[PDB]
């Protein structure tokens, strides 16, 4: 009654029969902006079906020597579907997300992942190596899009913060002896109630193998990791022509 689930929203459902449990980030569901909070005076659009779908984005192969990946949300979906068309026309934006990452393996493979969220995941550099040149990260390390980006130094998460206490932020583990998926429901976290969808990326989805993959030779050596996400309770405002960046 906990191992088996089904998440239907929009026209797309996903079934899982070896889940762990759904955690709701910071204990509350995504919701619409109340009139106590809103400052924009134009009526928002709320598509309510066409953008609240599980978008399956990409597939990272996980071998025995991987480091970890990250996806900046919502810039994984400003190139995809009716979410990517409404977020490019409209200046303002708010939504929550239901984030579901699948990674199946046999009952002989082993290894654990820490799929975790963290809001305002800013990216530092190696500062020129020795630490004296103020190098800023490029635009693709900042906002990789639906392609994702691989961590260089996952012990410090490319930001000088340790991964050992990433477990404070909303997370759950995918260890291949127990579960194969990890649902994380995230509300809209930001100070101001709407923001731009092209500039500001509210959070980043860190997916790091902490305990590495291991399997005896003869088993299937290709163990993919696919993340599917669904913008919940999304609404846009401030209509103008299409910007792409």
């Amino acid at each position: 009654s906990d191992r088996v689930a089904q998440l239907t929203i929009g026209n797309s459902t996903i079934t899982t029969q070896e889940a762990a449990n759904i955690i709701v980030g910071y204990g509350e569901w995504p919701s619409y902006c109340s009139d106590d909070d809103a400052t924009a005076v134009d009526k928002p659009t709320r598509p309510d079906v066409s953008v609240n779908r599980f978008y399956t984005l990409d597939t990272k192969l996980w071998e025995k020597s991987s480091k970890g990946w990250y996806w900046k949300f919502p810039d994984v979906l400003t190139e995809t579907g009716v979410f990517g068309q409404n977020a490019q026309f409209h200046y303002l934006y708010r939504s929550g997300f239901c984030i579901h990452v699948q990674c199946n393996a046999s009952k002989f493979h082993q290894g654990a992942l820490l799929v975790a969220i963290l809001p305002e995941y800013v990216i530092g550099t190696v500062a020129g190596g020795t630490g004296t040149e103020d190098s800023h990260p490029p635009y693709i390390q900042t906002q990789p899009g639906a392609d994702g980006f691989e961590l260089q130094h996952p012990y410090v998460l490319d930001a000088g913060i340790p991964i050992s206490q990433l477990t404070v932020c909303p997370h759950q583990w995918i260890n291949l002896r127990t579960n194969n998926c990890a649902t994380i429901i995230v509300p809209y976290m930001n100070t101001l109630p709407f923001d731009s969808a092209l500039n500001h990326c509210n959070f980043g989805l860190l997916v790091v193998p902490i305990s590495p993959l291991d399997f005896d030779q003869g088993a299937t050596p290709v163990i993919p990791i696919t993340i599917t996400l669904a913008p919940m309770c999304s609404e846009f405002a401030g209509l103008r022509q299409a910007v792409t960046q």
């Binding site: 762990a20 449990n21 759904i22 955690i23 709701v24 980030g25 910071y26 204990g27 509350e28």
Partner: protein, 58 residues
């Protein structure tokens, strides 16, 4: 006590015991605040809250 509601802690039901001498509430004392804590939104923010005694994966 005829001050403006200028403090950056407005947004709760109860007030605090902060003594103030000027007409602006942000110039007041820090005072003592309420000892309410909610660890369950960081410790176990699960959807269907399972108890201690049961096995978590039935």
């Amino acid at each position: 006590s005829h001050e403006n509601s200028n403090s950056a802690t407005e947004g709760s039901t109860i007030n605090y015991t902060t003594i103030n001498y000027y007409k602006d509430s942000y110039a007041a004392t820090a005072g003592k605040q309420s000892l309410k804590q909610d660890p369950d939104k960081f410790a176990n923010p699960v959807k269907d809250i399972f108890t201690e005694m049961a096995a978590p994966l039935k």
